[PDB]
Structure formats: structure tokens, C-alpha cells
Amino acid sequence: GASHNNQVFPDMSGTAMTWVQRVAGGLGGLTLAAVAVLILVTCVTMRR
């Protein structure tokens, strides 16, 4: 029988989690850039 606790979740810093985190970081950066652009635009619109 297995001598471990049967844990298959990779480390937060594992290669698979590293690629997932990279993709999430890029997507989040794009989303936050869009959010900042829209909020600046809306601020300018209420400014005028």
C-alpha cells in the first residue's frame, strides 16, 4: 500500500502552477489596464 497521504495538488510554485500563474497574471494585467483606461475616460467625461 501507499505510504503517503495521497496528495496530488502541485506546489504553488510548481511548473504547472507557474504557467497557470503566468497566464493569470498576464490576463489580470490586461484587465486592470482596461479598467484603468475606462475609469480615466469616465472621470474625464464627468469632468467635462
Binding site: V23, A34, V35, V37, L38, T42, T45
Partner: protein, 52 residues
């Protein structure tokens, strides 16, 4: 299931970003077209890909 959900989340993220970006572009380019005679300034024309 995990890969399908991740792909759905990525597609939703991309669609939301693109749509809200296009909302920003429209909101920025609508008044100039409404004016009977106007020229889209070249700075905003290139900044937001003016139709003409």
C-alpha cells in the same frame, strides 16, 4: 472539467475586456461623428482607430 472551466474563464475574460474596451472607444468617438461638419483630430484618430 478543470480545463473546460479554465478555457471558459479565459474566453469570458477576453470577451469582457474586448467589449468594455470597445465601449471606451465608442464613448470617446461618438460626439465627433454627431457634429454635422467636424474632423476627428489626428491624435485621437490614431489613438482609437477612427473609422475614416
Amino acid at each position: 472539467a478543470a480545463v473546460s472551466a479554465a478555457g471558459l474563464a479565459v474566453v469570458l475574460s477576453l470577451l469582457a475586456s474586448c467589449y468594455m474596451f470597445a465601449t471606451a472607444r465608442r464613448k470617446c468617438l461618438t460626439p465627433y461623428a454627431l457634429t454635422p461638419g467636424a474632423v476627428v483630430p489626428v491624435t485621437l484618430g490614431v489613438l482609437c482607430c477612427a473609422p475614416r
